[PDB]
């Protein structure tokens, strides 16, 4: 695998590590000019993003991924896509995607733009 | 409606036109260092990226637009998402997902990396 394919599968791993174990250190892989979408809501910079996350109604969280894709951008930043399940405590397996377009500010690898959508109907 | 969001509408509008009605001139919104990802498959430059396409077996398609995002990324870049349905000459109806990350380059609008995947999900 290309080196953009090592970091952004990397960065996916770790990103869903923190959000699975506590959601409240993602702030860690935000900036301030950071973006989420998430499920058609808006939110910018780290605080806000960082609030959202972990007002989600959850003790329990884990995500499974069952598909990812990776590729370099001329501005020489990752922009990644991942396909997969989450379990939240009790709730019904849900089906979710994710893009993530990643950029290295002061040597480490941050999130810029986060767009999460959910799966309507689940099996 | 945002710059970013009507920038990325009028790209996406824009790109399914082109590929409903004359695919050959699709080439046109890429440049040199594009990326594509057609259903998990890379196709990395813009000259792979044009004979992937040329290469399709349908003859005939159609894509609807069920969902989308749009979002600004500090280096001035518009990242777009897309859900929607598309049917292709007698195959049946299937949901798809794509990714598409612009840049105002030679001062056009162009597509530098794009992620198209089949889906199985409602999103």
Known sequence: ????????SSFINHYY??????RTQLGAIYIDA???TWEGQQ???????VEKLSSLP???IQHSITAQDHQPTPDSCIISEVVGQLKAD????????????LK???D???????????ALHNF
Chains 1, 2 share one sequence.
């Open 1 to 8: 695998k290309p080196i953009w394919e090592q970091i952004g």
């Open 17 to 22: 590590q923190l959000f699975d174990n506590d």
């Open 34 to 36: 950071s973006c989420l």
């Open 43 to 49: 939110f910018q910079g780290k605080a806000a993003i």
């Open 58 to 60: 959850f003790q329990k």
């Open 90 to 101: 009790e709730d019904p397996i849900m089906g979710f995607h994710q893009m993530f377009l």
């Open 104 to 106: 290295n500010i002061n």
């Open 108 to 118: 480490a690898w941050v999130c810029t733009n986060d767009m999460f959508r959910l």
